[PDB]
Design a protein around this ligand. Structure first.
Ligand SMILES: [Cl-]
Ligand SMILES: [Cl-]
Ligand SMILES: [Cl-]
Ligand SMILES: [Cl-]
Ligand SMILES: [Cl-]
Ligand SMILES: [Cl-]
Ligand SMILES: [Cl-]
Ligand SMILES: [Cl-]
Ligand SMILES: [Cl-]
Ligand SMILES: [Cl-]
Ligand SMILES: [Cl-]
Ligand SMILES: [Cl-]
Ligand SMILES: [Cl-]
Ligand SMILES: [Cl-]
Ligand SMILES: [Cl-]
Ligand SMILES: [Cl-]
Ligand SMILES: [Cl-]
Ligand SMILES: [Cl-]
Ligand SMILES: [Cl-]
Ligand SMILES: [Cl-]
Ligand SMILES: [Cl-]
Ligand SMILES: [Cl-]
Ligand SMILES: [Cl-]
Ligand SMILES: [Cl-]
Ligand SMILES: [Co+2]
Ligand SMILES: [Co+2]
Ligand SMILES: [Co+2]
Ligand SMILES: [Co+2]
Ligand SMILES: [Co+2]
Ligand SMILES: [Co+2]
Ligand SMILES: [Co+2]
Ligand SMILES: [Co+2]
Ligand SMILES: [Co+2]
Ligand SMILES: [Co+2]
Ligand SMILES: [Co+2]
Ligand SMILES: [Co+2]
Ligand SMILES: [Co+2]
Ligand SMILES: [Mg+2]
Ligand SMILES: [Mg+2]
Ligand SMILES: [Mg+2]
Ligand SMILES: [Mg+2]
Ligand SMILES: [Mg+2]
Ligand SMILES: [Mg+2]
Ligand SMILES: [Mg+2]
Ligand SMILES: [Mg+2]
Ligand SMILES: [Mg+2]
Ligand SMILES: [Mg+2]
Ligand SMILES: [Mg+2]
Ligand SMILES: [Mg+2]
Ligand SMILES: [Mg+2]
Ligand SMILES: [Mg+2]
Ligand SMILES: [Mg+2]
Ligand SMILES: [Mg+2]
Ligand SMILES: [Mg+2]
Ligand SMILES: [Mg+2]
Ligand SMILES: [Mg+2]
Ligand SMILES: [Mg+2]
Ligand SMILES: [Mg+2]
Lengths: 172, 172, 172, 172
């Protein structure tokens, strides 16, 4: 094994690689959302830029797992980054609903990794998750849920005026 | 009696303690409103922060009565702070309507204390009320009444778009 | 359930509401202590201001739990804030002794919530407790215990000169 | 009558002159206290300077009544300023006790003037009293009462060390 490796279970190493892939997948989904809202027949630029920012954040999350893996003496193993589920995202409400579910999927995988880390008695991995990932997921989920509530209040999907207002006053 | 006490009737001392409790009660009600508007299924953050600011203001009003009591040689006597009337506040209009009534309740109690102070020939307590409390109540009542008028104009409770617009352009 | 809720047990939600109430209770107790030391027949202003600062800190702790509850998709449920145990606090030593016990009561409730969070496999709630509450309790308990030791050394309760010296050189 | 005079009763004019004299009397008493604490066989300089500052404040209070009288179209009528009650003031405790009573005497005369102003339906004089005098008396009385409490705690009159400590840590 690596000269640095200490208290790092093979199962945790593998799960970190799988989580890295999911972070990359999330990044790629958000890129798709950005591109959709930048279309000339969609044209909600503030919405598009929200999703672009999230794409960048997810890619950073992936980089941080690569660094983590190496610090522990594990080995980064990459897999294909699957294309997003959809090619088109409907409207701001549908997209935010998809984003909420994505963030919850990410969160569940982080929680599952934390449970594995617990089971393997790996406090360093627990700490990393708790300090760098779990709170940010709660914040994202809350923000996107708040947006959904507001989009519903604004009459989405039918109310175009409401959609316009959201883009111009919410997506700060 | 206290070495400092001069021209301070026992009835006024007791009424100051009761008023302190009401200020605390008002603070607590506004906290409830803050929490409600911060819910993910409510999500009117500017509204929530208006109510949080008012909660803080009411707590300051209570502190000022504690200090007043001691300055006059009275004795602070605390009672339980009753929980708010409601657990949930409906929407911005209902909440503002409740706030208006709360502010009027507070005002009436301040006015009643001023009448007692008058009857007991306590110009210092009259002055304190007039200089630190009575005008601020008039301002609050006016502001919240103006908000109500605007929420009605905006089509509350039914018009969600109107509610959104209020949160984004009024609650400065 | 709330659209945001994920891995948040009903028991933990309820326990967060109970803890919020205890934080508020602690705030209110410290306010009483402030008022007592501000009395003209007590007149230990630095002591009074220590307790006022702690009252404000506890209220902030309560606010942070309200925000936490909403972030997780729980619902803030308020109860009455019970008045403090005592109306008068004796002297600096007795008050500090009461404060120590209050801080220990708060701490025990935080520790119990952490155990519940552990049992329910809620690492986010564990982290929140560990990062925002548990260390601050240890610091408070240590500070107040150190004060007690010094008040005893200074001859409290009988030695008034010692009490004066403490107010003028310790309560920074 | 004076061309300016409006709603100013002769009784109120006379009472303002009497109050002016009392302010001057209070100033003179505090000067005596200053001189006593500056004696080489007393030598409590911070105490002395507290009393000197109060002497100056009382003289300012007197000047403000002279200006008030002229503004209303009354006529300043001066009387002798009686020498203080005592030539020597014992110690810090006795002096503070005398100061408390002086401040209460001043306050009672202000309150009596306010009652006369009320009876004569003179809101301008009421306002002047409330805005420029009555609160400052409450503050002085509270401060001096707090000092007394501390001097007693410090073992005055017998405890010289306590008296020294008060001069060096209280009279800010
Ligand atoms: Cl290993
Ligand atoms: Cl292994
Ligand atoms: Cl992108
Ligand atoms: Cl598609
Ligand atoms: Cl849709
Ligand atoms: Cl985080
Ligand atoms: Cl009285
Ligand atoms: Cl009475
Ligand atoms: Cl609040
Ligand atoms: Cl309700
Ligand atoms: Cl309604
Ligand atoms: Cl005011
Ligand atoms: Cl859940
Ligand atoms: Cl549950
Ligand atoms: Cl307080
Ligand atoms: Cl008691
Ligand atoms: Cl004791
Ligand atoms: Cl902490
Ligand atoms: Cl006239
Ligand atoms: Cl006349
Ligand atoms: Cl002088
Ligand atoms: Cl004499
Ligand atoms: Cl004496
Ligand atoms: Cl004043
Ligand atoms: Co991520
Ligand atoms: Co990067
Ligand atoms: Co842990
Ligand atoms: Co983020
Ligand atoms: Co108030
Ligand atoms: Co405050
Ligand atoms: Co205000
Ligand atoms: Co606390
Ligand atoms: Co706060
Ligand atoms: Co602290
Ligand atoms: Co004066
Ligand atoms: Co002058
Ligand atoms: Co003054
Ligand atoms: Mg090797
Ligand atoms: Mg392996
Ligand atoms: Mg495929
Ligand atoms: Mg941690
Ligand atoms: Mg953190
Ligand atoms: Mg937000
Ligand atoms: Mg007494
Ligand atoms: Mg009474
Ligand atoms: Mg009840
Ligand atoms: Mg005013
Ligand atoms: Mg206005
Ligand atoms: Mg729902
Ligand atoms: Mg439940
Ligand atoms: Mg009870
Ligand atoms: Mg920490
Ligand atoms: Mg220390
Ligand atoms: Mg003429
Ligand atoms: Mg005349
Ligand atoms: Mg004579
Ligand atoms: Mg004033
Ligand atoms: Mg003071």
């Amino acid at each position: 094994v690596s000269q640095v490796r200490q208290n790092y279970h093979s199962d945790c190493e593998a799960a970190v690689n799988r989580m890295l892939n999911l972070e990359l997948y999330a990044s790629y989904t958000y890129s798709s959302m950005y591109a959709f809202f930048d279309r000339d027949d969609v044209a909600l630029h503030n919405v598009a830029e929200f999703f672009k920012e999230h794409s960048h954040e997810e890619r950073e999350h992936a980089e941080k797992f690569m660094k983590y893996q190496n610090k522990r003496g594990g080995r980064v193993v990459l897999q294909d980054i699957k294309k997003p589920e959809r090619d088109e995202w409907g409207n701001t409400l549908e997209a935010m609903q998809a984003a909420l579910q994505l963030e919850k999927t990410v969160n569940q995988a982080l929680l599952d990794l934390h449970k594995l880390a617990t089971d393997k008695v790996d406090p360093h991995l627990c700490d990393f998750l708790e300090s760098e990932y779990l709170e940010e997921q709660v914040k994202h989920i809350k923000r996107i849920g708040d947006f959904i509530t507001n989009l519903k209040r604004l009459g989405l999907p039918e109310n175009g005026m409401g959609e316009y207002l959201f883009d111009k006053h919410s997506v700060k």
